[PDB]
Ligand binder design. Structure first.
Ligand SMILES: O=C(Nc1ccon1)c1cccc(Cl)c1
Length: 460
């Protein structure tokens, strides 16, 4: 029974509006409705993993698990196993997997982050799950960010707090936040970004939606504009949106957007918006393809419509050789030539690197680099040919070319990371000097770059 080199992953996000769901929600898990939808010919083919994020969820865990499992069994005739479930207030994540995957899944972590302070602490935040699927690390975040059209900067702050403080994945990756811990990270939820057009334009917006003309609305979507300005979700992907705004609907129909201010809304307008989103970030040169991104049309208990996204994701085996794991395989090596970091910092500490990878027995600390002044007022840290030769546990190119090296640049004075990035070993050639590059981030914001050359020796 061979180990897979690809799986499919379903991501769902639904703000349930504190109401129980209707009796049938299968259209969600089938990726049917509006947008990029799934072909009918796939309806009986189960996804490998289903990840369900809810917000304003009124159900108990037991109640929602029974609905989800009975839904999937009706679609697929498969009884899914529960990998994890975690709830913060009314924000919930459920991970279900095909029973054949049960002994491929390990290292299951859950965590939550509560956002805000005083007034604004008590209902917004995020839940997450991570695990290993054979050789591949997977992370999932469901966040309910701050509401309201004039609070985009709050939402961006909520995002930074969640990625800083959510504790998922391998704790030995101490310099790295969740945006670097996983082969594939999926971040979804009621992100609550709005279409920023004047209140007076509400009926104009509604008209546009009825004509399926979304371009002049998407050009004002706050998530797209904040991402384009590098204010949030740096280095994440999102599929093109081709479905109508998923908020705010009159309940029990989808014929009406309920946008006008009411006491129940704090006298705020809710112009039609794409509140409900799925984004992802995968390591460089790993296969990930979005195969659906859309909203259901027939689930109408909430003022939001459910959103679905599905992905093909590359996965790798749990590799064993005669040598590693448990020793190095001295037919493998990783060399860095002519490497330098460019940092936005004003500081003048010396810096050193750490190299982290599950292809190493443990992380590797470099010597301090040589600081120079860049022409345009930057710090350039030169490592030259001074960097330690990395000794992978396995030399087989079928394993080693699929790996990645995480890099942190740390202050000698504080041991704090000033920037994190990732280099793929999926090279065009072995035993050949080749350019490498990663941006560097800290707390998910750009802090610099790392570039140089690599030389990879495998057993072939
Ligand atoms: O123990 C598991 N899941 C849960 C969640 C709540 O209680 N048990 C588990 C462990 C490994 C693989 C799988 Cl498919 C499931």
């Amino acid at each position: 029974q061979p180990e897979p080199d690809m799986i499919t992953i379903f991501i769902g996000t639904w703000n349930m509006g504190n109401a129980p769901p209707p009796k049938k929600i299968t259209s969600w898990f089938l990726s049917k409705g509006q947008g990029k939808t799934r072909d009918d010919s796939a309806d009986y083919i189960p996804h490998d993993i289903y990840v369900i994020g809810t917000q304003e969820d009124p159900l108990s865990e037991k109640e929602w698990l029974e609905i989800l499992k009975h839904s999937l069994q009706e679609i697929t005739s498969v009884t899914f196993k529960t990998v994890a479930i975690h709830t913060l207030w009314n924000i919930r994540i459920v991970v279900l997997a095909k029973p054949e995957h049960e002994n491929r899944i390990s290292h299951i972590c859950t965590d939550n982050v509560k956002t805000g302070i005083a007034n604004t602490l008590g209902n917004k935040g995020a839940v997450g799950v991570s695990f290993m699927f054979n050789g591949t690390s997977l992370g999932f975040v469901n966040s309910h960010l701050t509401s309201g059209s004039e609070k985009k900067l709050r939402r961006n702050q909520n995002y930074m707090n969640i990625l800083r403080f959510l504790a998922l994945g391998d704790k030995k990756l101490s310099p790295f936040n969740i945006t670097h811990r996983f082969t594939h990270l999926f971040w979804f939820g009621d992100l609550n970004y709005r279409v920023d057009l004047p209140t007076w334009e509400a009926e104009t917006i509604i008209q546009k939606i009825k004509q399926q003309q979304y371009a002049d609305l998407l050009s004002h979507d706050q998530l797209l504009t904040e991402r384009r300005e590098q204010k949030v979700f740096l280095h994440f992907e999102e599929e093109e949106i081709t479905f109508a705004p998923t908020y705010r609907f009159e309940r029990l129909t989808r014929d009406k957007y309920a946008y006008t201010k009411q006491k129940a809304t704090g006298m705020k307008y809710n112009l039609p918006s794409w509140c409900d989103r799925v984004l992802w970030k995968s390591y460089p040169l790993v296969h990930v393809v979005c195969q659906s991104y859309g909203s259901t049309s027939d689930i109408m208990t909430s003022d939001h419509s459910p959103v679905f996204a599905t992905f093909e994701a590359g996965v790798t085996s749990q590799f064993v050789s005669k040598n590693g794991p448990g020793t190095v395989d001295s037919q493998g090596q990783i060399e860095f030539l002519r490497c330098y970091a460019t940092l936005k910092t004003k500081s003048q500490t010396k810096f050193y690197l750490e190299f982290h990878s599950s292809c190493l027995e443990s992380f590797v600390k470099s010597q301090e680099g040589e600081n120079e002044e860049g022409s345009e007022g930057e710090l350039v840290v030169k490592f030259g040919e001074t960097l330690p030769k990395l000794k992978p546990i396995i030399s087989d190119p079928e394993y080693l070319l699929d790996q990645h090296i995480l890099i942190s640049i740390k202050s000698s004075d504080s041991d704090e990371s000033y920037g994190e990035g990732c280099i793929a070993l999926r090279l065009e050639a072995t035993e050949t000097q080749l350019p490498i590059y990663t941006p560097l981030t800290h707390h998910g914001e750009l802090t610099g770059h790392f570039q140089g050359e690599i030389k990879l020796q495998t057993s072939q």
